[PDB]
Design a protein around this ligand. Structure first.
Ligand SMILES: Cc1cc2nc3c(=O)[nH]c(=O)nc-3n(C[C@H](O)[C@H](O)[C@H](O)COP(=O)(O)OP(=O)(O)OC[C@H]3O[C@@H](n4cnc5c(N)ncnc54)[C@H](O)[C@@H]3O)c2cc1C
Ligand SMILES: O=C1CCc2cc(Cl)ccc21
Lengths: 1193, 112, 56
């Protein structure tokens, strides 16, 4: 039995002083990074004047020398220009020119363009950037289709021909140097004769599968031969080179997979470098995301020390000056050049991933960004790092890649008068930098060489934008960033409009903090904390108000390795469970009397304790629940977020009129054994209720630790009792007479059993006992032919197999548009086989065990049934070491119809179906027809498809162009409808109001919209003489929050929306005519239709309804036949309410949120029926970086 | 400018649909589109497909896409004023079909 | 001003939309009121003319 965490994340090598200095700078505050860069970038007054003069001369040349002329010549609108370019791109997918020209003349120019050519506009976001300079994540394909029809009908064939010629030149000659390396090499002769050199970029990155990595490898290898043949002995400075991306060469290029990277990726880079060596060409390693920087240094170090590569100085390496580590990286590289004797080619760039780095650091809750947040800081950093490089030209070859004439001029003068080819060079991008560097290369200009980065294949802050902006003077463009920064009030102040991750929510609450698993200091520290956590004698005991109770004790085992004993649980007797409820009832007034802000302070203190204890908590979750480190971080963060969110919501809402329910039974699941456990308990507690906490039988230890933390934070023992045990303990708690509410997260079937037990009881005030039940989902993702396959595959792999698919949100059914299904399926299967399954005390493990042998057996029986039916089943092979735990291999099953899947399979099992484009709407129907409605994903770039699908899908949590898991507290409030839950959403603003007898008005909870059928009904009531009911109807229309539409604060690059919709059809069980009118008003005001109990005998009370109201009203004798319903309103005395509540619990399908009132309560209390529970919350999270960048950033 | 009911036929004077009425084939006006698809149109198209009327189901879907129902634009004007232009359903359309397919096409147009 | 705006608006709307496939109706009778005797007079006539129709 391997010692827990003994091999968690050993570094590739011991971290040298120089390597540790890099890591120390990773997230250094911006105010600390900038002063030394200012000092290093400082130049004399004379040089600064000379540089400003050279930059002026360059910019004057630039401003004194395509698509815009086309737009002008044909008077195209922006949308028409974009649509035309999309048409031209599509027409260029036709290889035979005569065939294409015939199509244009005979079909396209006559308006018939859709029948002859996947949407025409899949790449419109790119063309939009080309035409307008603005980026959108998604495409208004209806606007573009209108515009294309309009422009063709107005201008005909000539505009199409001009568009085709424009797109052909742009895509074949301006975006790329060539479509093939042979073509690119042919076209490079012209500028090589004028003194430029080239570095060819075979467009390739982010391999998803082994096959894709192998394809990029052979593209690089074939290109090295072609470039080396063409180089013809010109050597590494005068002759052309190649640039590669490490992410192209291995599908798992990450720190977590460092062993595979060194074992499998490094030999491939070595092989390519050996070929570049034999031709004596440059081979540059491009720089990618910040979390790959230091890993790439390990590859660089091995390569530069590998004697097989000796005698060649062509190895190159990019460093990104927008990164806080850049000068320390340069120190390391320069030292490596000295040690190895290799003159490393160092390409200094600013950096290409800025938007993505900001978003990632915010999502991960990290201390700070790994890049600067003010552009001027990157400019100073660049100049500072150029000074370091220029002092080391004897041991490295600096390559200053920039299109910024001010940056260029500063470095040109910094370099001074002594120059020779090979001392340093500039670099620029093909089809972008030549106008600038035509003013640099050559004895008649500045006589400095420039290497053109040449792609090969088939921002208002930017210099390139500002040079073309007439409102930007040359004086502005030649401003010295070094001296501008030096003069600022706070040197290095973070950008005012970018939130640190901790401040994502501003004054509302403090964001939880994560851990950077790419940081070697963090990994080393965490390794020790994790190991220490595994030496702890974790226990869970029945913790009653009166002290710990005796009980039957059993060991808790690691699901990934049953030899690994995590702790001991003493389980609660049925008698002590019942005693716990009585003790909670006795203590309820004392806890209710603690002022809400002090109860919230308890929550906030527990959040601080959990944050401080996160490393230890991680180790327990990893071993007790079988979770990976990353998922354990997310789980502790979620628990912290729940605590702080419900604390803030309490401070926003709860007063003395919002009385507690009384003792609340919180039954939590094993799959989020800290976060959902904490969230339910924290909400009930902070609402003023004492809690009986019943954790899942599988995961009592982290529950006991959560209770220990909450008690340490000030929750009295009598307000929070821990009752470990099996379902017998849960059943005893639910059935206890003084149980005033139940919060349950778990299976739909157990929720239904709880509902049936609660249906027998009424509160002291004669109301149904509230049940908040979050249950399963049969979660689908729809992917159309406009989606980017690589993004889809990553989001599918994560959504389906993260946490072994043991997320309630996990992707269960992937729906692939037929035209792209085979390609995406091939990539998905390839990505599946790159997953590492094993015991989760290793950072390299992607997917851990399922929770128990019974879970394993249930999942495997499903897989074998599908296999027995002839369905194609793809499974990763598991290592023999998995035998000691309970593992199910991640599995892909191809289904014929969504109906082939008849039950939620709670494991790492993805089902795939294919659909024809025209059947999309029926597909959404089939998804809805499961009766579930938890999470739903849509991958598309087309606004018409987004609008269509999101308006028809019935799910609580929608995700556009991203994964469907990991809903964030207060950002994607979480919870679904139908078989997936009662609501209200956890981590949302309606949650606490369910836990008090009189619900408060939640923050921001209102709507100016009035349901029009409500209004028609109120007029009808007045027509009938029911004047008081009409007034109540109008009041309900105003009080309803139906139509609420909010954007919730979250990370950049994402839009998080929260909306209140109608629930569906409400079952009305009235007793009196006035009661019926009040119930109908409540239901209509919240957008619902109704089914009215025909046994009420009140049919004569709804004579002559307006058709608008009649359409919403059904009469039901057989309630089970007329469902599913989405809620119920009941009128009667206590016996009638009890009998109706029992009949409603017997209805098949969803657990109905029932509200009950007596006739007298309806007359007395305008809020007898609360409208919070008659709307449906919907959360939608849209990835707005999905087109590749962030528009607003 | 222009109203409904007893106030006129439309299209509005000084608006983007006006010239289309004065030609035998109307053009697509500037900015005249909508990403909204009428859900009853969609239900009708599915019904047509389940019925095997594949040409009409296709025509119905195409009507749902080309409809500009739900258009919601802000028009340029003076500061201190917001000038909005929206396309809504007209109301109840009288259908006078001669053939079953004609009826399906008219219904698709009206539902879209 | 309204007459001027009609003229320029229908002119621009024409430049944005009208092509050879948008055939005219033919002679259009434009009957205008006394309460906007230039603006509505001009608007109807300008629209009919620029759409390619002769006007009465
Ligand atoms: C030949 C060549 C090769 C390159 N190779 C790589 C590579 O391997 N990896 C890589 O990441 N980049 C690479 N780049 C750089 C990247 O692609 C951009 O071209 C470069 O950052 C643009 O900088 P600039 O000096 O041309 O223009 P500028 O307009 O001067 O600088 C723009 C840059 O400033 C930075 N920036 C913008 N806003 C902010 C902000 N709010 N806060 C902080 N910084 C900000 C960004 O880095 C942005 O790209 C390469 C560039 C060239 C020319
Ligand atoms: O925790 C469990 C499993 C079975 C069960 C039934 C009820 Cl009535 C309450 C709780 C529970």
């Amino acid at each position: 039995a391997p010692a827990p965490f003994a091999d968690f994340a050993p570094p590739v090598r011991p971290q040298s002083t120089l390597r540790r200095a890099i890591t120390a700078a990773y997230r250094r505050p911006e105010t600390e990074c900038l002063p030394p860069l200012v000092e290093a970038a400082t130049q004399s007054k004379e040089i600064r004047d000379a540089a400003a003069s050279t930059a002026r001369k360059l910019i004057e040349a630039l401003r004194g020398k395509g698509v815009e002329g086309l737009v002008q010549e044909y008077s195209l609108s922006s949308q028409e220009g974009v649509a035309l370019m999309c048409l031209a791109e599509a027409l260029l997918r036709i290889p035979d020119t005569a065939t294409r020209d015939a199509l244009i003349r005979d079909k396209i120019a006559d308006g018939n363009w859709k029948s002859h050519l996947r949407s025409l506009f899949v790449n419109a976001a790119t063309w939009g950037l080309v035409v307008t300079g603005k980026l959108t994540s998604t495409v208004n394909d209806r606007s573009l289709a209108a515009a294309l029809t309009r422009l063709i009908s107005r201008c005909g064939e000539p505009v199409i021909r001009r568009g085709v010629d424009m797109a052909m030149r742009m895509m074949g000659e301006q975006f790329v140097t060539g479509e093939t390396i042979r073509e690119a090499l042919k076209r490079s002769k012209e500028l090589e004769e004028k003194g430029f050199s080239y570095s060819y970029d075979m467009l390739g990155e982010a391999a998803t599968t082994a096959a894709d990595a192998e394809r990029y490898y052979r593209d690089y290898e074939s290109a090295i031969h072609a470039i080396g043949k063409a180089s013809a002995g010109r050597g590494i400075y005068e002759g052309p080179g190649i640039s590669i991306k490490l992410s192209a060469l291995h599908p798992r290029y990450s720190r977590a997979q460092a062993a595979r990277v060194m074992g499998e990726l490094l030999p491939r880079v070595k092989a390519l470098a050996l070929l570049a060596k034999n031709y004596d060409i440059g081979l540059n390693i491009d720089a990618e995301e910040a979390d790959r920087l230091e890993l790439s240094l390990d590859l660089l170090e091995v390569l530069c020390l590998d004697g097989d590569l000796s005698g060649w100085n062509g190895m190159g390496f990019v460093v990104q000056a927008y990164g806080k580590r850049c000068p320390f990286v340069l120190d390391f590289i320069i030292d490596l050049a000295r040690r190895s004797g290799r003159r490393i080619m160092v390409r200094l760039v600013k950096g290409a991933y800025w938007d993505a780095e900001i978003k990632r650091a915010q999502l991960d809750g990290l201390a700070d960004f790994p890049v600067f947040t003010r552009k001027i800081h990157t400019d100073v950093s660049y100049i500072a790092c150029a000074a370091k490089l220029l002092a080391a030209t004897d041991v490295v070859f600096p390559q200053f890649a920039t299109h910024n004439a001010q940056t260029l001029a500063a470095i040109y003068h910094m370099a001074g008068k002594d120059f020779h080819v090979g001392k340093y060079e500039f670099q620029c991008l093909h089809g972008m930098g030549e106008p600038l560097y035509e003013e640099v290369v050559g004895r008649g200009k500045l006589d400095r060489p420039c290497r053109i980065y040449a792609p090969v294949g088939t921002a208002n802050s930017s210099f390139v934008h500002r040079i073309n902006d007439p409102k930007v003077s040359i004086d502005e463009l030649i401003a010295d960033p070094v001296e501008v920064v030096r003069a600022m009030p706070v040197v290095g102040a973070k950008h005012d409009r970018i939130a640190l991750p901790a401040e994502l929510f501003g004054d509302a609450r403090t964001n939880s903090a994560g851990l950077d698993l790419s940081n070697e200091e963090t990994l080393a520290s965490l390794t020790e904390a994790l190991r220490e956590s595994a030496a702890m004698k974790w226990t869970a005991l029945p913790q009653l108000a009166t002290g710990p109770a005796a009980g039957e004790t059993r060991t808790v085992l690691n699901p990934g390795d049953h030899r690994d004993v995590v702790g001991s649980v003493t389980e609660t007797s049925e008698e002590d469970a019942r005693r716990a409820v009585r003790l909670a009832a006795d203590a309820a007034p004392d806890w209710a009397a603690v002022p809400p802000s002090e109860r919230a302070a308890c929550l906030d203190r527990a959040a601080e304790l959990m944050q401080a204890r996160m490393p230890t908590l991680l180790g327990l979750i990893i071993r007790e629940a079988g979770k990976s480190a990353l998922n354990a971080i997310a789980e502790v963060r979620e628990a912290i977020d729940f605590l702080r969110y419900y604390a803030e919501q309490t401070r926003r809402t709860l007063g003395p009129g919002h009385g507690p329910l009384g003792p609340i039974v919180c039954i939590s699941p094993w799959n989020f054994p800290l976060a959902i456990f904490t969230g339910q308990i924290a909400a009930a507690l902070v609402a003023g209720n004492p809690v009986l906490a019943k954790p899942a039988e599988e995961t009592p230890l982290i529950a006991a630790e959560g209770v220990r933390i909450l008690r340490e934070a000030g929750i009295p023992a009598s307000a929070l009792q821990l009752l470990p045990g099996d379902g017998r303990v849960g059943a005893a708690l639910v059935a206890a007479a003084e149980t005033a509410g139940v919060m349950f997260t778990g299976s739909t079937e157990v929720a239904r059993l709880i509902q049936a037990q609660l249906a027998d009881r009424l509160s002291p005030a004669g109301r149904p006992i509230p049940l908040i039940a979050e249950t399963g989902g049969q979660n689908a993702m729809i992917v159309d032919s406009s989606a980017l396959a690589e993004q889809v595959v990553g989001d599918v792999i994560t959504s389906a197999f993260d946490s072994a698919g043991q997320r309630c949100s996990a992707l269960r059914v992937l729906c692939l548009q037929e035209d792209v299904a085979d390609r995406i399926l091939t990539m998905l299967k390839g990505a599946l086989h790159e997953l590492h399954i094993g015991r989760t005390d290793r950072l390299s493990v992607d997917v851990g065990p399922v929770i128990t042998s019974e879970a394993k057996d249930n999942i495997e029986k499903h897989i074998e049934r599908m296999r027995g039916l002839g369905r194609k089943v793809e499974q990763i092979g598991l290592a023999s070491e998995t035998g000691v735990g309970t593992f199910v291999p991640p599995t892909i099953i191809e289904l014929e119809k969504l109906s082939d899947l008849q039950r939620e399979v709670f494991g790492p099992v993805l089902h795939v179906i294919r659909y024809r484009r025209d059947d999309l709407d029926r597909l959404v129907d089939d998804v809805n027809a499961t009766g579930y409605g938890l999470t739903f994903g849509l991958h598309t770039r087309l606004d018409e498809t987004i609008a269509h699908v999101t308006s028809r899908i019935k799910a609580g949590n929608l995700y556009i162009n991203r994964n469907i898991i990991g809903a964030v507290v207060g950002v994607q409030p979480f919870g679904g409808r139908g078989l997936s839950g009662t609501g209200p959403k956890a981590g949302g603003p309606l949650y606490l109001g369910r836990l008090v007898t009189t619900a408060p008005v939640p923050p921001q909870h209102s709507s100016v919209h009035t349901d029009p059928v409500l209004l028609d009904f109120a007029k009808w009531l007045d027509g009938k003489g029911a004047r008081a009911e009409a007034e109540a109807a109008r009041n309900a229309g105003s009080s309803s929050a139906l139509g609420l539409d909010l954007e919730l604060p979250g990370p950049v690059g994402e839009r998080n929306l929260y909306t209140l919709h109608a629930r569906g059809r409400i079952l009305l069980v009235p007793a009196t005519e006035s009661g019926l009118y009040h119930q109908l008003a409540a239901a209509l005001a919240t957008g619902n239709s109704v089914a009215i109990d025909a046994a009420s005998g009140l049919q004569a009370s709804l004579k002559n309804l307006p058709q608008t109201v009649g359409l919403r009203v059904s009469w039901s004798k057989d309630w089970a036949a007329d469902g599913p319903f989405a809620g119920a309103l009941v009128e009667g005395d206590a016996e009638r309410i009890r009998a109706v509540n029992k009949a409603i619990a017997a209805l098949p399908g969803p657990l109905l949120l029932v509200q009950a009132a007596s006739s007298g309560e309806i007359a007395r209390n305008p809020d007898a029926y609360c409208l919070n529970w008659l709307v449906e919350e919907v959360s939608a999270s849209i990835n707005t970086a999905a087109a590749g960048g962030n528009a607003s950033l």
